[PDB]
Design a protein around this ligand. Structure first.
Ligand code: BM3
Ligand code: BM3
Ligand code: BM3
Ligand code: BM3
Ligand code: MAN
Lengths: 257, 260, 260, 260
């Protein structure tokens, strides 16, 4: 396997993308801690065996969970920071302090705290001929805004520049740092995530491939960015969006018109 | 003047860029509130007359109070320039403390959010759009909103936050007659002394990395704040004007003829 | 006027954006050559007086001849706006012919290169930088310089070409006192008739994809050509000013309140 | 192997990146045509067996002939890597000749267009999509697709062209079951000798501007060509994978701890 013998922590590991990443990592020979909220971990099953579940709460909690995870793995080669609150709130005019703080604190500051803890553990465990790997999960919303979700969109721009600042500062310490930017991803397991009629029409217009992605289609990039061969890739984004961010006036194309 | 009769609030108005913007706005016929920390306002003079100083503190209670007072004194609000910002690095990301992280995110990202939400609500209350013309929000980000300097992860992250906040604001506020854009400065000498980038290793890297081979002046950034606030810029929203002497356009600038 | 005493060439000067730029430049005190095809110049009127018409054809021989004549009549060159462009799509990439490819690349990419090389040489010959101020090259790209419309691969490719040409020119010409920037318009109605984007499916997609919910006017683009040509923009080079009503800032605009 | 049973054409297959890609593709179970100039193919050896060499001249007649022959021998086409490219600078933009311009645009932009149009038509003819899996076009651009090096305006312009071509292809070919992406390498040492970036001023600027402080190896780029060609990458189209050791992510790298 392409990750044979590597120690990995995946946060948000109960959710769609996090879950698909745990499974792809186990399948490629890694030892994997799956970190998420206690209830969620309780309620999930993985199609691959070997996952070490560890409950956490995306500051004291984060440090405790990360220390425990590194203790059980005997080190740390790979961090996938997949923990994230999703969803919109309404127009920016009515955006409350509580909604702002929740998205910024959970998504931006939570990812910072997790990645600082991970990076320090990687250095302590001797990162660097080969390099440790930090992988953040951002969004096409790290670059272009959806309506009525200013707190989530701002946080994602924060995560994108955090990723680049981390790449720059951690290069000397033998750690490579990159982001994965998914477009729409159906996480229902049911093919019902984007089935609301107006939403399904706009997916057909705005995504070149005309559909949402599956979690497995994102996890594959997390393997690519964790493997030995990706040793000159740092500070970059792998965008996984079926052409969403590449296209304008996609509603006018042949086949849609 | 190009801003004749418009009501403007400029935050960070004691600092270099904020100060140059207050002066350009007064020169172009606007009524201007200059907002900054009380001490700083006390210690500044403007080369143009008419500025209405109002002390503020980018808590949240403070921001609302200062904005309400500002709008009361202006009799409305057409233009907001959110220039308040903590600058500077801390050290390597490995040693970045919770306190430094929180301070940059809370002051630069959340402070800009709180100021812009207050501003936007005041603009709507004052009838933005009603005569066919649009109110204007202008945020000051940085080349660090797109590319990272070393040893400043908290500041760089916050600037990415401000860049996407700006685009989310543009999208949501278009229906309310408000246009929202960012100005992204590269290196800007704010000493008044031409000494801001004079440390020898730094001055060498400015010569290599900036195509024009020098730092900018605050006035060179203020000119874009006038452009983005004027009536003519009525189809410009969700965009960035980058003011960096070619920094973000160039790679291997140390190899160019004249440098090598 | 903001361009008082400056010598400017505007190419594509019969067309919408080029015409609006000639008029804004005359209104701001510049001496202006209007360059375009002979027939088109014959068929156009400007709402401002003073334009020096000069026919051209974006041969290479033609471009040099026209530029030499223009510079002779102006007595120098401070400002070039390279607005000449073939627009329009062809069909799916699978069926894109050699003739359509060559025509879009040759006219839009190479024609902009030839015009800007001639302009830059003339600017240096006329002493660009000598008075501490810089000459200015302004290219007209598109949102298609960064994101692709369907069924227009030749036009889209050429626009990405022009975007990178612009940056390469910024880097190489900084030492010669010339600043180089691009303007990237989104949809612009050039009918004078409010009928450019009136086909019903198209009008629906403009409402969905443009935050301001309409096409721009030529005048809304020209305003940036003045900003980029004036003395105050002296630290701005290698950049893009995007004028698209939020098109490139937004995704899933069809879902927003007021549209769904 | 991850490409087991797939038919691939790799152009520029004698050169560093193209060679490393042919080898990685053979190692992952693909049948591979290696396309390049006749002399170069004659002079190269691959560390893996199975390559089908086919001479070509990125010569429009030549391209079609070589591609028809390649598809005939493979019995179809699942994967195209368009790696053919002229590299190198010329001098300042002011002195850039028509002949250098045309050679870079014609070989790098137009040659990539002709190759990819041929490839895409073959892929459709061979039934791309029928089994629910998609054919794959991979273009080799550069960090110069986005930011300019000095003294290489023709090469840089062409790379911006190839970047936007890639996106226009992604958009138009999605309905035909083909995914299209670019790989953007930073500095890559293609000497086999660790001498590519050894000139002292250059080596110094690589240390300053690349976060990893070195050039890449061809193998470090080829790995992304495998990723983009495999079945798992089925939601990735219109994108860029940048492989540059942090070059495009960083500013003022010369100031970082360990360098200053
Ligand atoms: C606001 C929000 O939570 N957006 C989701 C998803 O709903 C979107 O489809 C996707 C990008 O379109 O971003 C996100 O992953
Ligand atoms: C970290 C920080 O505060 N950066 C400053 C300044 O020091 C830099 O020169 C400039 C970007 O280069 O950004 C900023 O305006
Ligand atoms: C194919 C083409 O020429 N595109 C035009 C115009 O049709 C579009 O509306 C505009 C914005 O997409 O780009 C362009 O200026
Ligand atoms: C001039 C030129 O052809 N640029 C090449 C290469 O020489 C550079 O090292 C690389 C990184 O700048 O870009 C390119 O791939
Ligand atoms: O010229 C300074 C330069 O720093 C880097 O090398 C790159 O990220 C460029 O984009 C930036 O412009």
């Amino acid at each position: 396997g392409r990750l044979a013998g590597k120690a990995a922590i995946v946060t948000g590991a109960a959710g769609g993308i996090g879950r698909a990443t745990v499974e792809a990592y186990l399948r490629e020979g890694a030892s994997v801690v799956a970190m998420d909220l206690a209830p969620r971990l309780a309620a999930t099953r993985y199609e691959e065996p070997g996952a070490i579940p560890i409950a956490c709460d995306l500051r004291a909690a984060i440090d405790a969970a990360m220390a425990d995870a590194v203790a059980r793995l005997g080190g740390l080669d790979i961090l996938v920071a997949g923990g994230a609150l999703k969803g919109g709130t309404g127009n920016f005019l009515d955006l409350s302090d509580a909604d702002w703080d929740r998205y910024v604190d959970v998504n931006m500051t939570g990812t910072f705290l997790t990645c600082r803890a991970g990076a320090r553990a990687m250095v302590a465990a001797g990162a660097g001929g080969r390099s440790a790997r930090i992988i953040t999960i951002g969004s096409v919303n790290s670059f272009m805004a959806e309506p009525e979700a200013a707190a989530y969109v701002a946080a994602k721009g924060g995560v994108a520049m955090l990723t680049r600042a981390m790449a720059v500062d951690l290069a000397r310490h033998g750690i490579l740092v990159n982001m994965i930017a998914p477009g729409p991803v159906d996480v229902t397991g049911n093919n019902t995530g984007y089935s609301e009629p107006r939403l399904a029409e706009q997916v057909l217009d705005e995504v070149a491939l005309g559909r949402p992605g599956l979690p497995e289609e994102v996890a594959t990039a997390a393997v690519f960015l964790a493997e030995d061969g990706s040793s000159f890739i740092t500070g970059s984004t792998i965008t996984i969006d079926g052409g969403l961010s590449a296209m304008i006036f996609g509603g006018m194309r042949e086949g849609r018109r």
